[PDB]
């Protein structure tokens, strides 16, 4: 309606414009014409100019005009690898697979190209979380050893008994 039903179409229309490949920025008035919001309120023009078009993480202010932010979004295979590396280096955390698909068209090519470099963690809702594969220290054993490792129960022992075994065998 008023102050809410007009700003959204500006964002929605702008998103569609980028998909056409037009990286050129657009003015506040120019976007209004194509969004059929030429009659927008006067105090909405300044509010969008001062707050909406700067605070949003998808609006880039260029030479006084506004353009989409594809640089922040992952649109290349190299960017995908770099972003995960920063998350591990800075300990920011993983990213859901859905957040990358929308940002990276045909993300399957990039995900499969990197191969094992991406760690996929499947959530209960089938959502996959991507983490950087730190290849610094790697170690693995056969499933037989891992099953035997689980067969050695340890939560069922107290501290006194656990430490007693050390002197029992002489170590």
Partner 1 sequence: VPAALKRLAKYVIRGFYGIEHALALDILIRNSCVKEEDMLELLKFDRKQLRSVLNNLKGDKFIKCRMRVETAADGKTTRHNYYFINYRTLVNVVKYKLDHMRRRIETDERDSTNRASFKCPVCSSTFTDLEANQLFDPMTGTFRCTFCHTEVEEDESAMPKKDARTLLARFNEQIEPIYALLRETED
Partner 2 sequence: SGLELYAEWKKILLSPERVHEIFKRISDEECFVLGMEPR
Would you tell me which residues interact with partner 2 (CB under 8 A)?
156-158, 161
The residue among 144 and 159 lying less far from partner 2, judged by its C-beta, is 159
The residue assigned the tokens 């220290």 is 137
- 144-167: burial string, b at 16+ Cβ within 10 Å, e else: eeeeeeeeeeeeeeeeeeeeeeee
- What, of partner 2, partner 1, none, does residue 15 touch, CB below 5 to 8 Å by kind? none
Residues 6+ apart with CB under 8 A from 102: none
Considering the complex, state which of residue 42 and residue 141 has its C-beta at the smaller distance from partner 1: 141
Q: Is the separation of the CB atoms in 120 and 129 below 8 Å?
A: yes
Q: Which does 72 bind (CB under 5 to 8 A by kind): partner 1, partner 2, none?
A: none
- Six-digit token pair at 29? 């008035």
Residue 162's binding partner out of partner 2, partner 1, none, with CB under 5 to 8 Å set by partner kind: partner 1
CB of 152 to partner 2, least distance (A): 15
Nearer to partner 2 among residue 141 and residue 166 (C-beta)? 166
What is the Cα–Cα distance from 113 to 81, expressed in whole angstroms? 10
Query: By C-beta, is 30 or 164 nearer to partner 2?
Result: 164
149 binds, among partner 2, partner 1, none (CB under 5 to 8 A by kind): partner 1
Return the H-helix or E-strand segment holding 13.
helix 7-19
Strand-pair partners of 129: 96, 121
Residues that bind partner 1 (CB under 8 A): 91-94, 119, 123, 129, 131, 137-141, 144-146, 148-149, 152, 154-155, 159, 162-163, 165-166, 169, 171
Instruction: Decide which of partner 1, partner 2, none touches 171; Cβ closer than 5 to 8 Å per partner kind.
Output: partner 1
Q: Which residues pair with 95 in a beta bridge?
A: 130
């Amino acid at each position: 309606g008023y102050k809410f039903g007009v700003l959204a179409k500006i964002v929605n229309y702008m998103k569609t414009r980028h998909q056409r490949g037009d990286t050129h920025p657009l003015t506040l008035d120019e976007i209004l014409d194509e969004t059929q919001h030429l009659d927008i309120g006067l105090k909405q023009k300044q509010w969008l100019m001062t707050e909406a078009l700067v605070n949003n993480p998808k609006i880039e202010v260029i030479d006084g005009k506004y353009a989409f932010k594809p640089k922040y979004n992952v649109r290349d295979k190299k960017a995908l690898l770099r972003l995960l590396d920063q998350h591990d280096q800075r300990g920011l955390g993983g990213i859901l697979l859905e957040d990358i698909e929308e940002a990276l068209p045909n993300s399957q090519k990039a995900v499969k190209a990197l191969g094992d470099q991406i760690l996929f963690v499947n959530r209960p809702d089938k959502k996959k979380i991507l983490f950087f594969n730190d290849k610094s220290c790697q170690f693995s054993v056969d499933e037989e050893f891992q099953k035997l490792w689980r067969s050695v129960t340890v939560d069922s022992m107290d501290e006194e008994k656990i430490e007693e075994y050390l002197k029992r065998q002489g170590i």
